[PDB]
Amino acid sequence: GSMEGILDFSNDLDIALLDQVVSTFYQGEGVQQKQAQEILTKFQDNPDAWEKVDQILQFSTNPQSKFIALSILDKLITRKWKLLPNDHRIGIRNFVVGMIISMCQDDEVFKTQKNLINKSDLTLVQILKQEWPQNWPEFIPELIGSSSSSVNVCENNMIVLKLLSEEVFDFSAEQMTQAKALHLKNSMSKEFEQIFKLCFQVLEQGSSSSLIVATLESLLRYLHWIPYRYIYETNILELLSTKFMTSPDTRAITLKCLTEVSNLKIPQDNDLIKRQTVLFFQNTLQQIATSVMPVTADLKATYANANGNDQSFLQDLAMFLTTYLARNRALLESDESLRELLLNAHQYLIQLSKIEERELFKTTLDYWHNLVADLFYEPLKKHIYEEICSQLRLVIIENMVRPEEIQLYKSEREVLVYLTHLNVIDTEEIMISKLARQIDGSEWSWHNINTLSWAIGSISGTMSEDTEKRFVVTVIKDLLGLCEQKRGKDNKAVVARDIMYVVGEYPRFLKAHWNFLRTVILKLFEFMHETHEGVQDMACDTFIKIVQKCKYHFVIQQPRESEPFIQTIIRDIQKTTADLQPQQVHTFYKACGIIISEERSVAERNRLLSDLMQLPNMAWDTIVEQSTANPTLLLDSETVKIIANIIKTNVAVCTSMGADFYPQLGHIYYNMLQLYRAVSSMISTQVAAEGLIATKTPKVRGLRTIKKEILKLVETYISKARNLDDVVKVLVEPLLNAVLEDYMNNVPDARDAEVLNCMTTVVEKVGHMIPQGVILILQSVFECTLDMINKDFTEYPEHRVEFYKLLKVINEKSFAAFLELPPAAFKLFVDAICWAFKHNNRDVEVNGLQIALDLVKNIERMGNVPFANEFHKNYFFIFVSETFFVLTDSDHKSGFSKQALLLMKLISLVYDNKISVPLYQEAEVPQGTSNQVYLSQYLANMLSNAFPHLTSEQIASFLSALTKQCKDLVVFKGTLRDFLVQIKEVGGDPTDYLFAE
Amino acid sequence: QVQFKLVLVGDGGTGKTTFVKRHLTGEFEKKYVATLGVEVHPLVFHTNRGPIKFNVWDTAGLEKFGGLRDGYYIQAQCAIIMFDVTSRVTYKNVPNWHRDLVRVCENIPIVLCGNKVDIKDRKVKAKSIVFHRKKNLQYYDISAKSNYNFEKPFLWLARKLIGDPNLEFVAMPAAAPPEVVMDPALAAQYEHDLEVAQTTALPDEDDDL
Amino acid sequence: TMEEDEEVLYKVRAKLFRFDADAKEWKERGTGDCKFLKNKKTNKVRILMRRDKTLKICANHIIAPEYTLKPNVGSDRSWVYACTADIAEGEAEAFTFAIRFGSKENADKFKEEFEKAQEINKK
Ligand SMILES: Cc1ccc(C)c(N2CCN(c3ccc(C(=O)O)cc3NC(=O)c3ccc(Cl)cc3)CC2)c1
Ligand SMILES: Nc1nc2c(ncn2[C@@H]2O[C@H](COP(=O)(O)OP(=O)(O)OP(=O)(O)O)[C@@H](O)[C@H]2O)c(=O)[nH]1
Numbered sequence A: 001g002s003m004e005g006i007l008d009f010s011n012d013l014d015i016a017l018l019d020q021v022v023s024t025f026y027q028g029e030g031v032q033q034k035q036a037q038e039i040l041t042k043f044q045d046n047p048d049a050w051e052k053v054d055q056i057l058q059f060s061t062n063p064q065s066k067f068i069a070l071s072i073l074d075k076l077i078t079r080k081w082k083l084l085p086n087d088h089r090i091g092i093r094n095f096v097v098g099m100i101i102s103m104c105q106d107d108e109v110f111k112t113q114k115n116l117i118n119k120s121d122l123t124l125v126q127i128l129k130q131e132w133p134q135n136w137p138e139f140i141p142e143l144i145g146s147s148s149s150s151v152n153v154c155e156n157n158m159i160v161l162k163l164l165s166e167e168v169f170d171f172s173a174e175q176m177t178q179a180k181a182l183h184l185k186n187s188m189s190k191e192f193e194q195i196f197k198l199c200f201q202v203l204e205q206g207s208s209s210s211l212i213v214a215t216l217e218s219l220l221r222y223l224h225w226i227p228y229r230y231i232y233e234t235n236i237l238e239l240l241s242t243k244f245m246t247s248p249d250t251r252a253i254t255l256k257c258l259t260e261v262s263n264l265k266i267p268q269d270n271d272l273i274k275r276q277t278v279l280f281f282q283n284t285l286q287q288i289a290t291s292v293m294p295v296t297a298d299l300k301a302t303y304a305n306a307n308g309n310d311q312s313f314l315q316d317l318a319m320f321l322t323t324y325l326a327r328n329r330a331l332l333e334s335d336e337s338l339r340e341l342l343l344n345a346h347q348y349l350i351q352l353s354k355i356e357e358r359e360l361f362k363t364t365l366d367y368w369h370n371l372v373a374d375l376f377y378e379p380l381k382k383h384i385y386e387e388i389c390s391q392l393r394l395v396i397i398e399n400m401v402r403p404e405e406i407q408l409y410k411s412e413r414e415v416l417v418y419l420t421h422l423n424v425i426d427t428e429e430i431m432i433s434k435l436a437r438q439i440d441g442s443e444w445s446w447h448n449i450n451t452l453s454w455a456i457g458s459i460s461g462t463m464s465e466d467t468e469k470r471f472v473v474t475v476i477k478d479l480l481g482l483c484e485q486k487r488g489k490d491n492k493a494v495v496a497r498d499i500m501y502v503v504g505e506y507p508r509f510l511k512a513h514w515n516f517l518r519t520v521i522l523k524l525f526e527f528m529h530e531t532h533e534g535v536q537d538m539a540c541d542t543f544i545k546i547v548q549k550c551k552y553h554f555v556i557q558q559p560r561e562s563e564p565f566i567q568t569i570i571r572d573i574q575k576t577t578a579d580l581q582p583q584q585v586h587t588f589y590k591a592c593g594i595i596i597s598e599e600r601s602v603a604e605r606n607r608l609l610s611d612l613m614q615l616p617n618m619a620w621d622t623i624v625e626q627s628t629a630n631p632t633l634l635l636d637s638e639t640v641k642i643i644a645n646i647i648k649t650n651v652a653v654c655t656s657m658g659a660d661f662y663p664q665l666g667h668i669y670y671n672m673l674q675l676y677r678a679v680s681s682m683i684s685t686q687v688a689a690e691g692l693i694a695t696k697t698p699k700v701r702g703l704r705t706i707k708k709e710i711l712k713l714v715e716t717y718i719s720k721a722r723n724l725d726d727v728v729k730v731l732v733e734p735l736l737n738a739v740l741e742d743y744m745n746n747v748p749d750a751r752d753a754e755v756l757n758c759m760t761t762v763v764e765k766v767g768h769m770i771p772q773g774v775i776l777i778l779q780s781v782f783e784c785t786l787d788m789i790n791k792d793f794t795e796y797p798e799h800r801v802e803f804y805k806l807l808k809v810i811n812e813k814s815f816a817a818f819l820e821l822p823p824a825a826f827k828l829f830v831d832a833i834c835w836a837f838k839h840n841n842r843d844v845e846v847n848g849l850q851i852a853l854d855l856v857k858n859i860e861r862m863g864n865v866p867f868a869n870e871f872h873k874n875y876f877f878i879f880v881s882e883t884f885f886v887l888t889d890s891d892h893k894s895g896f897s898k899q900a901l902l903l904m905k906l907i908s909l910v911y912d913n914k915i916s917v918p919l920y921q922e923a924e925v926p927q928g929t930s931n932q933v934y935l936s937q938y939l940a941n942m943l944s945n946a947f948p949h950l951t952s953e954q955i956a957s958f959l960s961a962l963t964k965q966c967k968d969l970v971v972f973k974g975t976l977r978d979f980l981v982q983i984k985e986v987g988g989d990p991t992d993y994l995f996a997e
Numbered sequence B: 001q002v003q004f005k006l007v008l009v010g011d012g013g014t015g016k017t018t019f020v021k022r023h024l025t026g027e028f029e030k031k032y033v034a035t036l037g038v039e040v041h042p043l044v045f046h047t048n049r050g051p052i053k054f055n056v057w058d059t060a061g062l063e064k065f066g067g068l069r070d071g072y073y074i075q076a077q078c079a080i081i082m083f084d085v086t087s088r089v090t091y092k093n094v095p096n097w098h099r100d101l102v103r104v105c106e107n108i109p110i111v112l113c114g115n116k117v118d119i120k121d122r123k124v125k126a127k128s129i130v131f132h133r134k135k136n137l138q139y140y141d142i143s144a145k146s147n148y149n150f151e152k153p154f155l156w157l158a159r160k161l162i163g164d165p166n167l168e169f170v171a172m173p174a175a176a177p178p179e180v181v182m183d184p185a186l187a188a189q190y191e192h193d194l195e196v197a198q199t200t201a202l203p204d205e206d207d208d209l
Numbered sequence C: 001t002m003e004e005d006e007e008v009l010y011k012v013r014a015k016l017f018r019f020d021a022d023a024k025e026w027k028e029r030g031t032g033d034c035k036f037l038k039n040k041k042t043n044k045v046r047i048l049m050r051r052d053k054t055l056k057i058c059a060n061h062i063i064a065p066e067y068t069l070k071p072n073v074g075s076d077r078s079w080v081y082a083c084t085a086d087i088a089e090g091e092a093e094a095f096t097f098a099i100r101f102g103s104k105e106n107a108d109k110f111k112e113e114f115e116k117a118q119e120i121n122k123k
């Protein structure tokens, strides 16, 4: 098309053509917009495009064109600036300053082209970062001088100073060397006295609200770093807290300023400063009460109505009050004349806490947590806040969330527990009266009865046992009445759920009162027959939650009972669980396993485990008979579901019983590993007949589920096993025989990554006791898994993760298995580690770097022997260059800390002389030469080729600092980050690598 | 029509394109194809106050595919900043994206979105996410994959841009669909395309739906 | 909404996919309430499916007598069928659809109701 003409640089630039392309991009649609976009991208990315910038700024009438031109300039200033001759740098500086002053002097352009002026200012600030103050000592005096000549220039100068302060103090850590950041911070600090005088004058002299707002915007940035005396020893505190709070144009920015004032570093022992800290708060809240809204205002309604900037203002007020009071409320607590101020400030927070806005509620909730924790421990404070705490109890109860929202529920519970300790009678009265409002129907709703139930549950354990007993009885009585009142099982189920919820949160009551606990369990068994949605789920969740807390009461013979209640539960288990879904039956069996683990007499525990497992074991025995008689019976989808649900029931009981589960695992183990083999045959058979698509069929996913649940059962047992001698003598050999060859001899798409996970647990727990087993695991899984995952970063994501977890534990527990690899296979191990480094999947990358670290430590342990010397000769420079690759390429930032640690370990090995042989091959360097001198040479050469725009001086200074700092990780990391800044630009100062705090 | 420019910014691989695509077509793209510069797509919601259209500028998060960078933000009326709750670095870069965005767009509604909350191993914990507070950003936990809160960013922005706190998404009108006809000429053609579709497996066969 | 003139014969939660030729892959179109709507003027039964939360239309077509619910190789709880005229995205298009349900029972109930709706549409 015609637009592509701007990309042809052999011709002079048609500005009118550029303006059309830019208009087509910003204002056009679909196909035309997409083409302009690609064209503008290639124009901008042309390394000579910056030469056209002066032409475009002078002769373009499209503000978007000039904006894109300034981006092209910014790319030059931040990256290649130091290549330019000094005369051209002053040229560019002068045309940018000229365009800014020119746009500020024209009222129409100043008003309507704010985008281009702010971009121009940011462009100037990039020049200041390069040139100032060493090649521009008069910048700040001239800016101040130029400020008295015009309101527009003064306002725009406040934008430049704000952006300069952001670039030097807020955003420098990342983007500059430590030495350059220190230089610019000291430079701004040295000239600040002048900057502040101008800012203070504008604030006193007033008039233009747009100038005043921009000055306060720059002040907000200054408050991140300036010393307290500029705030406390001038009239500025009075101005911010009186004049600038009254007008609404300045109020938003002023409140943010006063929040940062509240965070200044300040002397602790000075009564005048204390009075000044009190006074500005007093002034601010007075201006709020008289100019914005009284303490009584309904901020919930105001925020919901969302007129103008009210939402931002109420957020900022919450931020100001919480920040100030968290630091300073003790200044208001002793003086009786400051009591009204302290409670007004808290009453505003109470009103802000009623606003329906999650994130605002969280901000206020963090303050209430701070306050009520202080009232719990600090003497003579609770009585000050009695009426604040009473209102807060209602606010927290009315806002309680389900325990599923873990962080928010945790915070709410903690505040409500502290408040209950401070006044238990007030907490009880509010909860009982909110319950009365559910019963009379005035506040009745599913959300309201759920919220109240969550609140009543959250405070379990805070009352004395007696108070708790009377309260819990009153609440259950009231909810029972409420349940009976209501019509339709929708409503009855909601109240039944909440009864179940509350009872499950009060275990101390249940443990003291056996008859009640028995009735509750029997009632949960009744509800396991209710198909109304949510009820069976809740009956099962409540059963296991009560068992976790009260299990001892199920395992003893309670007086006036024939037997321990666990025997009663087991006897009736067929009848109890008949209407439950499989996953609910598994929770039920898990819960029984928790009870049975309480029985420490071996014979009685084994008998209970036997009785519990009767129904699955009889289903299992009947299936093994048929299945062994005829392998065809297993093809039936119904038989496959029964088998999976037996294995899953075993997994569920083994989860809760761990080491105690062994006799049950013993009953099924050998037939279970024969079933694993038979199922493997059927999957192989089906993929042969149907192709890879077979792996997606319900039949094959059903068979694979049996394999995965078997590996899960064995992994679950071995992870918790106590008798490791039986694991090695009875479990491991048959397990390896059933799973390893089947994994190796399946096509990639039929291999189960769960095999790798199971083997990881085996090596973790008993790796030291099965050295020949670890060798066999590696021979089976290593090359075939590596070939699945070494073509791209995406295929076989589960195999990828479990593979590097398995190499990690083998490298920790049975490093000898890697010594028994032939050299070619040990080379694939090094390749695999380096492959992990290059991953963006953070699980893989992190394991990759840890294996590399542990591998070096394993080699160091061997001391001075052939294998260790051959490791260094063959692989030292591979690890050094691979670690440098991922440090420097900008695509692996998440692993920075472990890349640094690995690189430090490698540099430290040579700097200490802990490597015994020359790292260089014969006749490549004088034969006497130390590894330290060759490492210097190899790295300088490698960095020079990879970063040819760096000087020899930059590279040699970097390597000098790096090797000196290779026992000091935090300083070494700083040197690495300094290097990552300098590779992004030309002409980085080599003295930066000498940086010392 | 009533239209608003929305810029979507954040680190590479956080879910910007996946989130937008889910809203445009309903699909979940599992593959990561890095955006080159910007992808522009119109997106219409039906509200109780009539249709609202977002001109969605879905920008590149990778520095090497950044294209015009802050040139994409010019005349944006609203924005989403996206990070990945499974990747700490992506939350660390939120202040960098916010900085570049507000220098161009000084007074606009902005949603901060922590994507991928469907993933079991969350690395950016609730307690750490406070950047939005002092910057007056709305914050949502989302998942483009589970659809957790996936309407919330656009519902919030629409309430801010229309200036109606009670604005709701409503059911778009559903016309009576036409009659079947069917062509003997395309009969054999239909069998072919149905054969391939029946023998390609539906994705995510372990999901609740 | 344009649903006031219709009775609901069947409602079930489902996920809907469309086959793309270009990429040999299924693409989700929506998840939500799938409804069989009988027009009280014509006695014509359509499928109407809306997305959760946005309530945008992901399926809008007559349950044609000539359509056949086929198994998908990967699922015991899905149907695939060619649709000649779906108006969800606006202009009548042919699609190969797959619809998946929570359970085998919901899939089998869906098929029973879909054949019942085919018989109503034949009259
Ligand atoms: C409808 C329904 C739903 C769920 C449950 C657990 C129940 N329950 C029915 C059995 N329950 C009681 C029935 C009668 C009576 C009585 O005062 O005579 C008492 C209870 N239970 C209690 O008072 C009680 C109180 C507190 C606790 Cl933690 C456990 C039990 C309370 C538990 C009822
Ligand atoms: N688990 C999970 N993965 C997600 C989710 N959203 C997106 N992804 C995946 O994240 C990857 C990257 O998604 P993209 O949308 O391409 O990321 P992006 O932010 O647009 O990337 P750039 O264009 O490079 O900035 C893809 O593999 C998505 O499938 C989510 O909610 N959950």
Ligand SMILES: [Br-]
Pocket: B130, B133, B134
């Ligand atoms: Br904060």
Ligand SMILES: [Cl-]
Pocket: A511, A550, A552, A553
């Ligand atoms: Cl006890």
Ligand SMILES: [Mg+2]
Pocket: B016, B017, B018, B033, B034, B035, B058, B059, B060
């Ligand atoms: Mg993208």
Ligand code: NA
Pocket: A445, A446, A447
């Ligand atoms: Na209700």
